[PDB]
Design brief:
The PDB classes it as ribosome. This is part of a larger assembly, with 1 copy of chain A and 2 copies of chain B. By secondary structure, chain A is mainly beta. In chain A, 0% of the residues lie in helices and 61% in strands. In chain A, strand 3 and strand 4 form a beta hairpin. By secondary structure, chain B is an alpha/beta fold. Chain B is built from 12 helices and 6 strands. Chains in contact: B-C. Chain C binds one RNA strand through residues 5-6, 8, 11-12, 14-15, 18-22, 24-25, 76-77, 80-81, 86, 109, 111-113, 137, 141, 143, 197-198.
Chain lengths: 56, 247, 237
RNA sequence: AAUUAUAUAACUUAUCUAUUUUAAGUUUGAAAUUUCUAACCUAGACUUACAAGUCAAAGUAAAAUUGACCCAGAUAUUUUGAGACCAAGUUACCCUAGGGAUCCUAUUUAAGUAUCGACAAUUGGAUCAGGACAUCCCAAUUAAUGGUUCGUCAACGAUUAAAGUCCUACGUGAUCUG
């Protein structure tokens, strides 16, 4: 319970489609910018972290 | 041993009496020691049960000095848990009134004794560390020789009573070492509402802002030596009584 | 670390620290705690032996707790003899066993625990006058040292009676217990007389202090109440 | 008990009345309730109340310290969430099921097997201590060898080579009764 290493965040598409998915990142690292498949545009687009959900 | 073998509540009372965690769970504040039992006893508490060695409880020799505490059998391991001393008397855990508040966790004796310090002076409601902090626990109250619910000094405050302590229109002051002057404060001059933050926790910024509603100024006790600060709970006790007298 | 406590010198040290009468006969007692040992060195107490753990000695933190004693690596057995308590601390030291005045006078032998607690409060209070009986009772025992916790770190009968002749009133204090700053403990002469730890202080002890001409400030916790009074005493000054 | 208790009854506010500028609260209780990005698909399997989630041949397709669902959110239908609820008594007012009456001891061993039999293996006191090792004293990493006083959950006083941490129906002497 006390131990806390990673965190869960929302990765939101930069294409404006509103598609989002959750990914795990280390708490002490910088915000993630990832290239992920967006079903709405049916092609890989850049995703940027917006908010933290919980402590993993 | 359980107060009554069949009675689960009796066992809980005895267990809570000689148990810091169990007492907090069962809302019991025990005053370890016959003299300290009288301390809580004379502070306005009629302990329902008193943590004492099974044979010792039967003898009730400390109960004679409890002066209200009801001697109850207590397990040897439980007695060690409540150790801060054998006779732990478990008990339920205004304008110009003494008001002590050992905000946050602190020395168990400091919190309990500081809160009780206001009671005798004429404290309408004396406060201690919050329910989360171990202040009304059997061992926690044992060092302080005070009962939370029964005595005006309360430690198992809980959320409801926690606003109650602050809710009064008595100017509040946080006293550690240099929080005007301990007895020359606006809070000290006005009805006492002293609330010292935890020694290792400090005073919350929101609490300092809330002091504006009370209208009190944090307590600053001049220290000739280079010591960083004195006992936070102890300072609250002095400020608690000091405020009532000045008010 | 040195784990040999069976030496004759170690046995003598263990007897003095473990037993108060042996400490008085040998004039040596043990203080447990790195902070307490460091305070003893500042106070000028001359320690006879410094107890340092196998790791504490290497870290040099126990060495700083020598309290003027020689610091050497010591195991549990050696530390136990050096320390006055059964359980030896990681850092411990074996050492020797008016108008508006603040005076506390204790006659005869006094409980070592009470002395440590009183001295710790006195340091915070900053009283300029202190009274006591002779040095018969040893206040350097591990229990007494624990009571002081470093904050604490010979007036005798003749000088002690002088404090009694002085017109001072001991401010009363109780667990439930006028205000601390409303009592002229520092503002007016004070002759602190209350039930000691060796005898016990009940609610009558607070009344007894009031009977000395002071007012109330029911047995209060010795450390908590004294510390609260010390803060009030500093404010009084 | 635990949790309550708009049966009624009261008060308060409405209400309803005087003048004049029953309902809702709460309380009693008629009672009530419970207890004591890391794919998709698809043989065969796992996990599982249900559901979802797993492993996996084949196939197809991208590439080269929690854990799901329900259920609530957010928004515009896309996404995001970590089988006695909790809970005391009493019963000879009872019910059912029955059970009764109407330092030895038992093995094993055998130093000294007719008859026996050590060591073993299966209230305070007085007298005398036995044992555990996590070693205080005594002793040479090893060792429980013998000891570890008297008093006032903590503490103190005085001795002792030392007053380890403890256990042994007050450790242990042979009232009398039910």
């Amino acid at each position: 319970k006390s131990k806390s290493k990673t965190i869960l965040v929302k990765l939101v598409s930069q294409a404006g489609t509103g598609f989002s998915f959750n990914h795990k990142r280390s708490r002490l690292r910088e915000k993630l910018s990832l290239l992920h498949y967006d079903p709405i545009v049916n092609k890989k687009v850049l995703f940027v972290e917006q908010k933290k959900i919980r402590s993993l | 041993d359980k107060a009554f073998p069949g009675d689960r509540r009796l066992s809980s009372v005895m267990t809570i009496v000689k148990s810091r965690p169990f007492r907090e769970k069962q809302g019991k504040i025990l005053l370890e020691g016959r003299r300290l039992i009288a301390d809580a006893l004379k502070a306005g508490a009629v302990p329902k049960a008193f943590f004492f060695s099974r044979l010792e409880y039967v003898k009730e020799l400390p109960v004679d000095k409890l002066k209200d505490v009801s001697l109850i059998k207590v397990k040897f391991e439980d007695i060690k848990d409540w150790s801060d001393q054998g006779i732990m008397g478990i008990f339920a855990k205004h304008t110009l009134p003494l008001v002590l508040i050992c905000d946050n966790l602190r020395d168990p004796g400091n919190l309990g004794t500081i809160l009780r310090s206001a009671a005798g002076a004429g404290c309408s409601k004396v406060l201690l560390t919050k329910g989360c902090v171990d202040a009304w626990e059997p061992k926690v109250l044992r060092a302080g020789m005070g009962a939370h619910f029964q005595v005006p000094i309360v430690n198992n405050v809980e959320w409801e009573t926690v606003p109650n302590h602050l809710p009064p229109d008595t100017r509040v002051y946080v006293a550690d070492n240099c929080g005007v002057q301990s007895y020359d404060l606006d809070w000290t001059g006005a009805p006492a509402a002293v609330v010292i933050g935890g020694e290792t926790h400090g005073v919350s910024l929101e609490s300092l802002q809330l002091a504006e509603s009370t209208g009190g100024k944090r307590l600053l006790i001049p220290v000739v030596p280079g010591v960083d600060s004195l006992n936070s709970a102890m300072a609250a006790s002095i400020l608690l009584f000091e405020g009532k007298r000045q008010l």
